[PDB]
Amino acid sequence: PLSLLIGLRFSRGRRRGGMVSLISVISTIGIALGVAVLIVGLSAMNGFERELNNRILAVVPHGEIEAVDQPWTNWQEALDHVQKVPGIAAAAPYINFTGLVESGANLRAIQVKGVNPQQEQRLSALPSFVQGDAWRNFKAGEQQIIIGKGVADALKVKQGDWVSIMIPNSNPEHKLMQPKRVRLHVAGILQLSGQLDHSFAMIPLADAQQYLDMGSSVSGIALKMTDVFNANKLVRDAGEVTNSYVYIKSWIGTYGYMYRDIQMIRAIMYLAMVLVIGVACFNIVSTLVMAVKDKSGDIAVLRTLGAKDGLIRAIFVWYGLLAGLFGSLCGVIIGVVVSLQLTPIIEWIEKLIGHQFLSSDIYFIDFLPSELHWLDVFYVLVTALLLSLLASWYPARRASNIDPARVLS
Amino acid sequence: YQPVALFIGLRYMRGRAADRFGRFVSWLSTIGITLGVMALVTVLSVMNGFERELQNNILGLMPQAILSSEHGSLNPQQLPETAVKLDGVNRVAPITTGDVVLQSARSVAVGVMLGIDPAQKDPLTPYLVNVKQTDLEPGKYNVILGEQLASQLGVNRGDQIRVMVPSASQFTPMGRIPSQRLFNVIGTFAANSEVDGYEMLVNIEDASRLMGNITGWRLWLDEPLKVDSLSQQKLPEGSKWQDWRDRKGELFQAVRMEKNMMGLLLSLIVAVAAFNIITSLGLMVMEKQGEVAILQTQGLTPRQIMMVFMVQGASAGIIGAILGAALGALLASQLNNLMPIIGVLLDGAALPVAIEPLQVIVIALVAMAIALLSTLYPSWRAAATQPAEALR
């Protein structure tokens, strides 16, 4: 299965000169720079989407339906109506607040919500990231409250210490009263990725009824549909079975910007890597014009032996592909090791300079994940070879218009 | 003709084949540096546009730096506005700062205290919605809440709230009482920022923390992005430098870290194009072995023959950085007039482009230097070789 074009012209590349031994080295690192960073760059973007569905998407409520200054009391009839809709899986109520912690002279804003302990597992992956042994001790009526790990970095407390939070006051008339101040205790701290730790706190549903003087009144209903790609249209028709109009929202207006910026870098980093190999393909052009005048005493020989026009063109086409085969395939072998072992590599540079990047204050995570996909390996292999076809076509066209009788032959 | 014999030996060597492709090979190193700077200015100008619109809505609305005391409060009779003569300060205004907590009848919120002066000019004055500036009398305890702050609280105009100061709590042998007062609201303001949920306007004269004086002086800098260099200045006595890095020290620090990652990724085009100069100049000596030794016989020292190939690796970097910085400014300034070449407009909210004139000088001077690092090794092989042992 060996052709005259590829394997029979392989011995032409075994040349010998002066400083030509450094030319094959400098034409390999320059073209592998556009492949090695693109392999570890596309695998790092796949790791962001993997941690989005596990630590961001699986912990937030998808749909939220609230009244317009009413304590919603008829939530028993509005539970079976939204459950039998073909496209919404489960539902669970929530009573959100805007309390804050006053313990140790530290100011920190927190969002206190009240859900059911025996119902929160059926619609979200929230208690699957608790730093304790389990979460089965989270019961109602025992004055318990579970706060995040990032809160305790500012409260300077740990598991088993008493906490003092603030509760918004309830009043049937618009009048100001003295705010309440109770003393509770934490039962297990937890972190989610690096972002929702200092902005989350949950209480039992039965404890929220006695703290706010409400019998069986809730404020909102949280659900979860099948696909998260169309969460704006499936939330509009879900609230039309209770009353005329309610407050409708989703995660697109709050956390939907993380999926928007994950596609913008894929249109910039892939566009920048074409310009890297596009300049790196000029080294193949510079070594192909010099290969014409080097083998100028051999093209005119084959024309006397009886070579056609297409035989002379296709020698230098696959000659430049051999220089591109040694550089593009060497970026794949160096790209797998950095992608599969990115976790000790990034941690080694963070303990060198001291000031580590990607802190858990503004970003949604704190570490750099990695997920290597074999579909992007075939995409970068056909891209570096297509740019080598363009670079080795125009010097190959000039190698056939030369005259065999002009040279000393 | 040329009076210098160092530049005349290369002006007839930058392509001599009369062909449409024979002249394109010798100019391959020019386009590689030209496209490197062109793919660096137009991308970093959008990152400078996001940083310019972030400091005008967040840093341009809050007090950036304040010169407060180091052992308590400040005395304006001892340290007046004539005493503060720091560089970069454009205006001095008295203000106080304190982490407080709000209190209402429906919900409880958090925010800071800004003791502005109603007799002076405030940057939040055109952002007011039917609120008067001179309505903050010293003794009526009026407070102006934000739009996002009053939205989650349900406090309309004419109501009454409670402001408690947890930091300036007076010590008592029984209990723990905070120094709190009673304030009434007069209206909200829409500022189109994120500071409408934790900032409020109040009179400077108040007895909610101590006693009556102020804590510090509010200043306005020409550049709020490099306030680290202005912290080691000779300060007057009885004062302590306080910047905006105590609250927003991680917000704007992540923007500067992203410019060092995108600019480093796009700098690989210049590093690859620097490797093309080793291919373009290292192959020229291997074919022109006859033109080197004859110049050594004609009376040229090996020091002078090293500088012949120096401009051959530097003139492509000079014309590559000038044309690269020129086309980087033409594409950035003419981006949002016609149909955008990025495909679908993902934002659609008047995408700004900020072209800093100082940043173009740092980019062009670096790209003219990496073209000179890849020249010292091919020029040394043509100079340290023997004139009678290389070819003849």
Partner: peptide
Amino acid sequence: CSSNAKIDQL
């Protein structure tokens, strides 16, 4: 990133 818009919709 650094492009934060943060506009809701009721």
